[model samples]
Target: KDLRSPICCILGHKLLDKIRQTNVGGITQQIGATYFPIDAIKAKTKVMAEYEKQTFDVPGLLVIDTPGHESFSNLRSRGSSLCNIAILVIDIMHGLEQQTIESIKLLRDRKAPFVVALNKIDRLYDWKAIPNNSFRDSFAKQSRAVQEEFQSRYSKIQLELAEQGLNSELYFQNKNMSKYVSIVPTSAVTGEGVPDLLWLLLELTQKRMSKQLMYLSHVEATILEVKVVEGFGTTIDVILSNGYLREGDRIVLCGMNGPIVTNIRALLTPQPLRELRLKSEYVHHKEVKAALGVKIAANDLEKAVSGSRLLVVGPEDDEDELMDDVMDDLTGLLDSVDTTGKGVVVQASTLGSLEALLDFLKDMKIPVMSIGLGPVYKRDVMKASTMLEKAPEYAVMLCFDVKVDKEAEQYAEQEGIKIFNADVIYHLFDSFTAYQEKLLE
Candidate 1:
């Protein structure tokens, strides 16, 4: 077994696309997007996590990105949080917004340690956008006038954060980093100061969350995405999120058909910060450890849901107990639904997306009746039609980043039920509100 890496999530409003490009080593991916089909990033340290005994130099990081429109509550598991740390990004051009304050409170409520990323400094007046590993390296290079402007913006941000009860300074200027939130000046556009952000996160994890990152006796992982790609019949990408996962290990995964009991056939992992999209670079491994991203080749994974938790039944552990855990968690996810009430039917691409969307809806006092992954099915259409009889105003189905089946669409049309779909998460809500007004008219 090996040391488990810490789990980190990025939460903020605006300007994170290129910030992620720098964090993931290269390429602009999921960080700034509202809906992502696959898990965006897992940055490895010098060694493996979950599989232990090897010394951990810079502990690895498993980063989850959240949209500014929603909350970051998807990291919860068994009443606890899965994310050990977080990055709260604030655009330098605009100090702090509604989402920023709310996110800060949530982090404080959860006691989740986080660092502030003063992002988009390149957007500053008279600033030169240059690639940088350190903010200090870039800060000193800025002209005296621009440097003063940077300080003015930073001070304004600091004042705003203090109003929310968070004390922070430029990361290097802070002494007791554990107490004061560290702020890293960064530019997502130019790849500046991202290294400092990552480095601070790892250090924060090691010093604060060392016990949880023990990479101990138990095995833990989560299914990020389940896809049927060429060359592999059914492959499920996972973040062993921590603990030892070996080839031939029995991993329990929740599915539409209940928990699918299977074992890892081939465990493929890439070096840290590399996207799993590249099939060729993956090195096959007999086993992997905590806080690492891996593509697992296993049988009977057709119905495995992305964002579902995966549990390994250890060699000596009882299968029934692990199975119970999966079902209980499934029950938790299921119990969150409104079965006998009036609510719109919603379908999204992954569990995380659904969680975020549902959380956002709840904030607006919008109720969701039934939810599912994949395309909108005829069954969901029929479900919405039933609501017309009970609550005519609620007879609507919303699809987020997922397609509507032709059959479902035709059935919806026939039943006079409305189906609102949008690949952009916010558009769905906006159009729904506009249509609701038309209904009121």
Candidate 2:
């Protein structure tokens, strides 16, 4: 419960003060990643985590801290799987974000139940309410006409999911149908709707599984960071997954090759390290469970990496198996997509024309002849000629953002494959479009 209790009511207050220093949006963006996002704070409630001598009560809850970028796909999926329930954090003040929708699709594909936290509601303009009216109408009727605005957003999300072949109504509304998700509006500032959100979790936990809370007995932790501190041999900030990890128990690292197997050396909180200047008591191997965040110094320093398992060694069975399966599924899905690009084979040190290079062709209607992310090698040029037989428009092997190999260049010259390179996507798209239009003409 300490994890959810807020070691410091800092996030809201920090954001509130920061708006004066910089653009509110940019400040909020920077701060969300810097500290605990509100959703992560709530998700902590469902786990059994202990930090420093305090046994933090986690009620089978798991939270995944997500980064702010799309380039890092590896973080979201496998990281999310550790948490059985997904909370899609939406800024109610800003409506649904492009990234929020993407995250939702991912949660749904995994058939994971999710609740929407419409965060930053205190910032909602002119928000008012009627005694019995719907949340939408209550918000729209008063300070500002926000009901229609919110509903339009809600509908867009619903419709988009339906279009993507999901039963949006059943999944979101908790109707007579099976399998559902719910959305709750919340204000982290005033703590307006947080209680209701917890009530919803309680109801769902009881309805879904009666003995859910009792399951919170151990210290199962997820690796959050792998740091090389000046004193600590190998320190890790872990999100406790299932069981309690007590001090002195030896554990194996989950994610690396020949990972470090070490004992629980020490534990500390950010508070004492910053303020009290006191050493926090370390947890033993057996005291860790889901929903706890622990900063620990381990006895041995081996090949410990992020996303690797940190398990109590004696149990014999593996922990974090869910994460492994989740990773396998994501890898397969990504590999299934076609990634053909346009560009002719060429040995030139740099790509010449926009006409020769191609971009990631998976979503395009046309087939891809060949596409690779790095320097084009000899085999790549030869492969381009073969792929052309399957795709005539693929005469050009488009290499963008990188170089081409000389051996491949000779092959391309002999094979007459025109290779093109561009430093930018727009340049590549525009140049390719011009030549593509000529081909059609």
Candidate 3:
């Protein structure tokens, strides 16, 4: 709630007001939004989501406020996607922006269900909101001129959405709102229509997304970041998408060298009311369930990187059988790496990210000599250095969301193997194209 305002203009009204009352300064400076865990909505009786005026006992939403920056793709991509339902928060005043369009494309690519939050209704010309009022009531209180202006803006946005092949309608106007993409108008500052937004989210998830929320038999998780602390050695920040993980559970993590098999030495999660990045605030856990963020410390985690899958070996499962299954999965991922081609050597933090980068490379018609995960290591540089004699163009390295090892850095500079790195995927591609163009000139 504290970080909600930055994620979308229509949230955190109460928190913001409290902060203002305290006359606080520098209390809100954060690189990313906080992840708020929503407790399960326990229900004894079946409650219908369609009744707008009716309130029902339902589980609260666990909102993961991720960084809007490109580097946070690992958190968002957990076994395809971490979010079952997505909210594309668009600034209504600005209409459809570039990032909004990109978000739409991403949602379409993932085939994820999403809703457009047409926020900042308070910014509309001559518009004034009644606090704690519904969108329709607020509209009724406004003048005819203001209402007309609001409708005009809505129409423009609707047309733009249609151009992108999305069928959308305002929440109030739609008769069959579920049939089309529902656009919920809101004013976060005044707290008007915020309830409606929540209602719509709950409604959609209950009615359309109940199946995805069901439990899975196997443990499925994604490594978001791998950090090497002085004392911690190698620690992995992960989001568990399904199943459960215990302190002693043996897990298999995807690696450049192949699957890294290890047991969970410890499980830790951010302390109550504490941010996740603060290492000191983390509390140890014996076990944790699905749809949660956790920090894991274990042996042989040095090979683990961001975007890798984590599968837990159950008590009933056989280790050798699971190892073979893991090997088969690893084979599928490695098959996508075409080392026979001659263009450039590519390295990323995870197999999923590497796959995404490969797709982008293919679209750009760029060939790849080698592809792997983890940091740009000595082996990676050596491979690229070999390319210098046979194919100078292929004697380059493109790294995504990973840094070069100290030894590899020296080797790359000494051998003149061009290396380009970016935390963001698109930025990396842009840099690659620019570098290639500069080389030709």
What lDDT does candidate 2 reach at residue 301?
48
For each candidate, give its TM-score against the true structure: 0.72, 0.51, 0.77
Instruction: Give the CA lDDT, 0 to 100, for residue 271 in model 2.
Output: 42
Q: Per-residue lDDT for 1-441 in model 1, tens only?
A: 344656666786534465444231432222212211112222322111222222334444556553432223233442123467678888788789877886786676445667889888888888876564456767778899999999898899989999999888877778987668889887877767765665666666666666766656666666666767567689987655557778998888777657788888888754344565453645778877655666789999998876677887867878877777675644665688888889998877666566656766888899888877766789868888879988877899888767788998899888878888875556778988987898899
Candidate 3 structure quality by residue, lDDT tens digits, 292-405:
667788999887656657767877877767765655544665576677767788887665567667777878888888777776778888888878888766788988767798
Which stretches in model 3 have alpha-carbon errors above 4 Å?
1-58, 68-81, 159-167, 172-180, 228-231, 273-280, 327-330, 404-414, 423-441
Best by TM-score: 3
Q: By the lDDT metric, which is better: model 2 or model 3?
A: 3
Model 2: residues >4 Å from true position, as ranges? 1-81, 120-125, 129-153, 156-173, 176-180, 209-219, 272-274, 277-290, 299-302, 315-441
Candidate 3 positional error at 397, Å:
2.1
Clashing pairs in 3: 41-58, 41-59
**Weakest 10 consecutive residues of candidate 1 by summed lDDT:** 29-38
Residue 323 in model 1: lDDT? 72
Deviation in Å, model 2, residue 331 alpha carbon: 13
